[PDB]
Design a protein around this nucleic acid. Sequence first.
RNA 1: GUGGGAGAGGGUGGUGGAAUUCCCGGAGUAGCGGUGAAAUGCGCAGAUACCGGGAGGAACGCCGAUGGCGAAGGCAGCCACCUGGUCCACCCGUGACGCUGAGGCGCGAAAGCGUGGGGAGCAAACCGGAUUAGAUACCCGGGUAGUCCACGCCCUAAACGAUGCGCGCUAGGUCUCUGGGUCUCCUGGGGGCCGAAGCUAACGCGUUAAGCGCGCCGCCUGGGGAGUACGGCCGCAAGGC
Lengths: 73, 88, 119, 101
Amino acid sequence: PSRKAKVKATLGEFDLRDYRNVEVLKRFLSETGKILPRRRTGLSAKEQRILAKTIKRARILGLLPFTEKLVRK
Amino acid sequence: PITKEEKQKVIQEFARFPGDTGSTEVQVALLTLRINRLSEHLKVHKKDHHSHRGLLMMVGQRRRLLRYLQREDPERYRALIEKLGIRG
Amino acid sequence: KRQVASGRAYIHASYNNTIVTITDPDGNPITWSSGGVIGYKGSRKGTPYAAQLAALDAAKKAMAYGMQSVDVIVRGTGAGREQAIRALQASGLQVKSIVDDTPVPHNGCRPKKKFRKAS
Amino acid sequence: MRRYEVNIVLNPNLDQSQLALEKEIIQRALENYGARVEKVEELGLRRLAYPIAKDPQGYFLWYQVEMPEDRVNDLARELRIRDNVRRVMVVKSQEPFLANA
RNA sequence: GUGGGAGAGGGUGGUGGAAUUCCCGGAGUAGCGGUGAAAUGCGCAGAUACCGGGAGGAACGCCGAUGGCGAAGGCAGCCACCUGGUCCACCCGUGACGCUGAGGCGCGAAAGCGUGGGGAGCAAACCGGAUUAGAUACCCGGGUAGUCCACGCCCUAAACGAUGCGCGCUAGGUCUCUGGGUCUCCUGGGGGCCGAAGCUAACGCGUUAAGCGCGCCGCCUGGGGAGUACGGCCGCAAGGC
Ligand SMILES: [K+]
Ligand SMILES: [K+]
Ligand SMILES: [K+]
Ligand SMILES: [Mg+2]
Ligand SMILES: [Mg+2]
Ligand SMILES: [Mg+2]
Ligand SMILES: [Mg+2]
Ligand SMILES: [Mg+2]
Ligand SMILES: [Mg+2]
Ligand SMILES: [Mg+2]
Ligand SMILES: [Mg+2]
Ligand SMILES: [Mg+2]
Ligand SMILES: [Mg+2]
Ligand SMILES: [Mg+2]
Ligand SMILES: [Mg+2]
Ligand SMILES: [Mg+2]
Ligand SMILES: [Mg+2]
Ligand SMILES: [Mg+2]
Ligand SMILES: [Mg+2]
Ligand SMILES: [Mg+2]
Ligand SMILES: [Mg+2]
Ligand SMILES: [Mg+2]
Ligand SMILES: [Mg+2]
Ligand SMILES: [Mg+2]
Ligand SMILES: [Mg+2]
Ligand SMILES: [Mg+2]
Ligand SMILES: [Mg+2]
Ligand SMILES: [Mg+2]
Ligand SMILES: [Mg+2]
Ligand SMILES: [Mg+2]
Ligand SMILES: [Mg+2]
Ligand SMILES: [Mg+2]
Ligand SMILES: [Mg+2]
Ligand SMILES: [Mg+2]
Ligand SMILES: [Mg+2]
């Protein structure tokens, strides 16, 4: 499935290699701190591969979560 | 690593004529540069085997070129080896 | 001997047993219950019904402290998890929120042979 | 001489004197390792996704510099000596990679 | 040679968070655990469940793929340094400098060995509980070597594509990773699937050949006896060739 919406389709021009930008990056994470699959992010192998590394960098800096509690349920 | 100025320096040092990047002298000089650098790297980091294979291949290539030079013009070969300090 | 009136409810669910710890807003336990706290002994503690009874028992013991609202935290995947939540749903307590806190490793420790091939 | 970006998270509970002291220490340690500073960005106190040293917040510093490679690690180590420095991350500069261009 | 690219290729140092165990404190009480069902076990010297603090070892969730890199073994948190291979564009330089490769040398998963560290989890042997006609097992509770690090050995394997390396030649289609370009498409290097000719005992293979050819290496010659005996070489031993 995952035909609802995609993240690359939402945002405009943005830098994938910028780890200090939380506003952009946090859109690539789920309800939990998990990094979204390509079928969600809408990105490509290279793009995704870069995104992962920058998100991990942002996590280490303390800007992004490694994990989050799941609500609802 | 090996910067551009170093490489250019040795290239223009061993060049047969101005503008020669390809002659056996130059090739053996560049190979020798890399071999020395790599061996220096493997003085420490002696547990790095994958690079050691690189060293082997480089040594082999160099020895084959030198073999060619020896067979072709023994004088240029003598001069080369004398200059670089290879073969003992 | 407190009169807390608002707090947390931790549901810990296993295939073997379900157990419910009701605490204050700082996480300090007030009362608790489980499959074995009620009559159940063997495999029956793992039953959804046992989780219902454990949840209700915990909630009653909690309302003896005069408590009204709880935030529910759910850990573990097993039978009687959703039943425990569903019992607390209306136990006489107001459930303000539900959250799955179930702990998962980033693959630190080797599981027992029973749990291997999946990590 | 290569380009690097230095990320430094600082204790949010600092007053101006102590903060200026920390920035002095950082500046001096930078200069002592032969790092020339291309530019600097100070974002101040920002919230964190997770607590660091039992602090919900952090004070962020950014220094884009050009320094000799051989000293880089030793620089990082130095910046980590102080107690008020929570994180130090030194990244080799890279050109931006844009999506949706 | 020049200018660029991708990558879990390798080595060293640093660093991050989740989880497990243990210790300290708080709150709290009669069980927890575990199975087909149970029991051993742990718990009133207060466990389990919950919060806070600390210590330590080991492995890196999501990304993650039908993906990538490596000659093979194999390689996965992040950062920096050192370093191997490789692909593309330009058509610049040398002028056959090539291919293969007995022996030699190096590398070589796991287990195992020596010395010293380390030791959270897991766990051969072992100690117990169950099941069974028995149960030297499968299931449950413990648990030592070991698994981790340093240095030195061992040299094996379903070490597998069960397919030696190099070169040339023989329809296409489709999906994918990574370059270049006059960027719908063309062109180059990888990874898959279906298939022309052809091959094959069949299964299947089919520009990533198991087709058509040439060069060089290794190996086979019915099954059991047997990877045994003997000899030699290697190893501290186990044992290997
Ligand atoms: K078949
Ligand atoms: K013998
Ligand atoms: K022994
Ligand atoms: Mg480079
Ligand atoms: Mg049970
Ligand atoms: Mg180049
Ligand atoms: Mg690189
Ligand atoms: Mg690597
Ligand atoms: Mg305690
Ligand atoms: Mg015990
Ligand atoms: Mg007892
Ligand atoms: Mg405990
Ligand atoms: Mg300890
Ligand atoms: Mg393999
Ligand atoms: Mg030319
Ligand atoms: Mg000519
Ligand atoms: Mg050869
Ligand atoms: Mg080995
Ligand atoms: Mg081993
Ligand atoms: Mg040992
Ligand atoms: Mg055990
Ligand atoms: Mg029987
Ligand atoms: Mg018996
Ligand atoms: Mg056992
Ligand atoms: Mg023994
Ligand atoms: Mg010992
Ligand atoms: Mg295989
Ligand atoms: Mg194809
Ligand atoms: Mg292809
Ligand atoms: Mg046919
Ligand atoms: Mg086919
Ligand atoms: Mg016979
Ligand atoms: Mg035989
Ligand atoms: Mg046989
Ligand atoms: Mg044998």
